[PDB]
Specification:
Pathway: Aromatic compound metabolism; phenylpropanoid biosynthesis
Shape: globular
Bound molecules: fe (iii) ion
Family: Belongs to the iron/ascorbate-dependent oxidoreductase family.
Keywords: Dioxygenase, Iron, Metal-binding, Oxidoreductase
CATH class: Mainly Beta
Distance between the termini: 32 Å
Pfam family, one: DIOX_N
EC number: 1.14.20.8
Order of helices and strands: EHEHHEEHHHEEEEEEHEEEEH
Structural class: alpha+beta
Helix content: 25-40%
CATH topology: Jelly Rolls
CATH architecture: Sandwich
Amino acid sequence: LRLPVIDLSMKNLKPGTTSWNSVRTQVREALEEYGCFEAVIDAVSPELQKAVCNKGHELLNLPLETKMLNGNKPEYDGFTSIPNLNEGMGVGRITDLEKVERFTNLMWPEGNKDFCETVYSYGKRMAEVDHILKMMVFESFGMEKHFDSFCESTNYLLHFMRYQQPGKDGRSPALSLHKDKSILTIVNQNDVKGLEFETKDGEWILPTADNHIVLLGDCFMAWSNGRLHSPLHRVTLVANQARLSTSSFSFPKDIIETPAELVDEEHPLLFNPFEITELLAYCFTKEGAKAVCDLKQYKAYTGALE
Ligand SMILES: [Fe+3]
């Protein structure tokens, strides 16, 4: 039980090249079988990775009243906390420099150029990794001519989750089982492990914290008509130390729609089209939390599997 490891060294990785075609096959197979993979990413230096970790702590160290200024939508960017367990919040529209500048001046009226420049740089570099990976998936399904339309006005999110020292060694649950509602999520654990995936079998893979982890969200699973797997995951601390994760999410401009090419006799249409803002909100309500672990419990489900 160990994840695929995919070398996304940007060197040599241009469309049409030999290395690109090899990496494309690895990405498609990993996201079909596991829904995730460890990724070696040099689009971001170790120096920038540590700077973004420091910026996450600086944001989460602000007063509660300041963090609340980022709104009441914890399904996307809003401040969330389970007392004595975890806290988190996000920078929405991280690839829009004007939106990052506004967010920064909301949090730091006297200014914080270091925070704004660091997080925008990381968001831009990780969005290119997301773009390349989606492109490889589209190419793998014969859909490269539909790719630019899919990607128009992609929404990117940078999200920090912090986990308090659990007070014990061994094993301390810290975040509950869910599927992400992104297209892709790219996670860095900042040298402390705990992210844990359920296999299709029902086994558990707890990777080390040396590399980025790519995982599929329910938007890509729906786009693929269930051909790709969105994996169930949770966080379990394995040591008495604090943990901060840095995660990059892609979301569509508005609608996800499954292309006709991926529907056939053996693969009936699983999901009607749906709006991401509605899905995200719904999963955070009492009546809609059934959809957190399974998009088939959402209103878009066709009932095809009877
Ligand atoms: Fe997640």
